[PDB]
């Protein structure tokens, strides 16, 4: 048909335009920096109390409290300084895969296989944690929800679309439907202006909040994409796949920059995170241990082998003082 011929012409145009801008490879320009060395991290605190496998964990703005969700159907709010439990909120559905902590520190969020996103209010007057709002517009299972401010939220589900919700009115304002498969990761820019999404189609896309249109797409993977994160400067992002590889992308170049992989790794990637200076990349794997990579040299730095099952979650504080790791052993570990 004429339409498919035009599509092929446009794809070839995009390919040659991308190829034109390639100036130099990263290995040739990174061969003069001083190597990081060997990083040794030891466990400081182990938090117990969960019953089943643990599926999410988010820190706070003050690097003081954290929230954990497990298959038992309960949210736990800890205090990492003294290993206390501030709150334990029961749930209505035993299946949960999302958590979020509001930057202001007054709200928490949850979601799972019940196709509904629940918002809980913490700083109440009666002393009991009460559910504020429930959002039930999606048709697929939710994968991750992240706050923007005290009155806006963004959600991704298995219905191949992402949505933006306003809490007070209860009705979504803008939906993004450019994908062809299950969207299962998203991260926010530090300036809260753009955000990226990773799908089941071995692809990632960058969206604009008010514009509502996909502005730039990236591909190159061969299998599913499981996690994604934003560089602190807001100009790059790293993605993890089931091909046992991590890939770093820049937005201004519309091209791959670095690939981290090794022949001795076969399992899949389930969580990715950055450090404060952007010099360290932390990646959780499926073979019961995590790994540390140098973002500018593509070399190993150390292994945080301290678990007995899958390491599902990964988080880094705002000040970068500690690293939190969850797992399916119903245990959380804090490293420094």
């Amino acid at each position: 048909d004429q339409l498919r011929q035009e599509a092929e012409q446009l794809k070839n145009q995009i390919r040659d335009a991308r190829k034109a801008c390639a100036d130099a490879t990263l290995s040739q320009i990174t061969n003069n920096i001083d190597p990081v060395g060997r990083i040794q991290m030891r466990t400081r605190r182990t938090l117990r109390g969960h019953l089943a496998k643990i599926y999410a964990m988010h820190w706070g703005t003050d690097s003081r409290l954290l929230v954990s969700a497990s298959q038992d159907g309960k949210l736990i709010i800890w205090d990492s300084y003294t290993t206390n439990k501030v709150h334990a909120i029961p749930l209505r559905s035993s299946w949960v895969m999302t958590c979020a902590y509001a930057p202001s520190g007054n709200y928490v969020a949850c979601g799972g296989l019940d196709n509904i996103c629940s918002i809980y209010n913490l700083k109440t007057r009666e002393g009991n944690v009460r559910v504020s709002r429930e959002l039930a517009g999606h048709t697929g299972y939710l994968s991750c929800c992240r706050f923007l401010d005290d009155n806006q939220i963004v959600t991704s589900s298995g219905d191949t679309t992402c949505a933006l919700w306003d809490i007070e009115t209860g009705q979504q304002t803008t939906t993004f439907t450019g994908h062809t498969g299950d969207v299962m990761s998203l991260s926010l820019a530090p300036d809260t202006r753009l955000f990226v999404s990773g799908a089941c189609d071995a692809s990632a896309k960058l969206w604009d909040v008010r514009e509502g249109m996909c502005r730039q797409t990236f591909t190159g993977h061969e299998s599913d994409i499981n996690a994604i994160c934003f560089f602190p400067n807001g100009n790059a992002f790293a993605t993890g796949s089931d091909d046992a590889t991590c890939r770093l992308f820049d937005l201004r170049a519309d091209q791959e920059l670095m690939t981290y992989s090794h022949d001795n790794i076969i399992c899949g990637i389930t969580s990715v995170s950055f450090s404060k200076s952007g010099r360290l990349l932390l990646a959780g794997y499926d073979d019961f241990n995590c790994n540390v990579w140098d973002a500018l040299k593509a070399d190993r730095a150390g292994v945080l082998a301290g678990h007995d099952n899958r390491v599902s979650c990964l988080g880094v504080t705002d000040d970068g003082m500690a690293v939190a790791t969850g797992s399916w052993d119903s245990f959380l570990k804090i490293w420094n």
């Binding site: 109390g49 019953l51 496998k53 298959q71 038992d72 309960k74 003294t82 206390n84 439990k85 501030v86 334990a88 299946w95 296989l113 196709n115 048709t139 697929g140 299972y141 298995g158 299950d182 299962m184 089941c200």
Partner: protein, 225 residues
């Protein structure tokens, strides 16, 4: 150096821990089951999203997920500790049967369900009996190999039925057992049953075969099976 605030925090943590201990006690002593089937299988009327029921002072939980689509490979990783998986298969529609067999293959061969047993329920036997008693059945057309089949000697037909209906009834069970026999041994097996729409003995059957699954796992753990 402990102030009043620290004491209040300790008291709150102790109360939370006591409630958690009670929840763990009430949780660890229950069994979980996941139900699977297709549309028109009749999976909602065998005993809707969740169900609790007890038999002989033993608890049982029934789970159903139906808000998703044909692909299910993503959320099946959570159910890696279920005691058994219940599968409901219709037998009235011959055309929409081969497809069902395909849905049985992946479940038997998924890498996250390598040590999970499956209980089969062949539903709607009255409809099959009425259809095969009448002359509009064309089983050979939808399945070419039916002509050479003969009733096994190990079969135990229920007295008071046509031989044709028992032959056709065991034919369907043959292909479902063939997939189980072809791959997988020593970690999981299949337990066939012939369930009608009005039957009330399903709970007893689930009790009996779940007991067998648990006993087999416990015998295997001490390495004497």
């Amino acid at each position: 150096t402990v102030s009043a605030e620290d004491k209040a925090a300790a008291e709150r943590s102790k109360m939370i821990e006591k409630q958690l201990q009670k929840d763990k006690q009430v949780y660890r002593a229950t069994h979980r089951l996941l139900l699977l089937g297709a549309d028109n299988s009749g999976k909602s009327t065998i005993v809707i999203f969740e169900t609790k029921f007890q038999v002989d002072k033993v608890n049982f939980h029934m789970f159903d997920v139906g808000g998703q689509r044909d692909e299910r490979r993503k959320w099946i990783q959570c159910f890696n500790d279920v005691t058994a998986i219940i599968f409901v298969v219709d037998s009235s529609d011959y055309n929409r049967l081969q497809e069902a067999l395909n849905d049985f293959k992946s479940i038997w061969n998924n890498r996250w369900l390598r040590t999970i047993s499956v209980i089969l329920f062949l539903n709607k036997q009255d409809l099959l009996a009425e259809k095969v008693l009448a002359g509009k059945s064309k089983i050979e057309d939808y399945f070419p190999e039916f002509a050479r089949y003969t009733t096994p000697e190990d079969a135990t037909p229920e007295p008071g039925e046509d031989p044709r209906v028992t032959r056709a009834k065991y034919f369907i069970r043959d292909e479902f057992l063939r997939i189980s026999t072809a791959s997988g041994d020593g970690r999981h097996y299949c337990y066939p049953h012939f369930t009608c729409a009005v039957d009330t003995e399903n709970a007893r059957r689930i009790f009996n075969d779940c007991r067998d699954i648990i006993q087999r796992m416990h015998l295997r753990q001490y390495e004497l099976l």
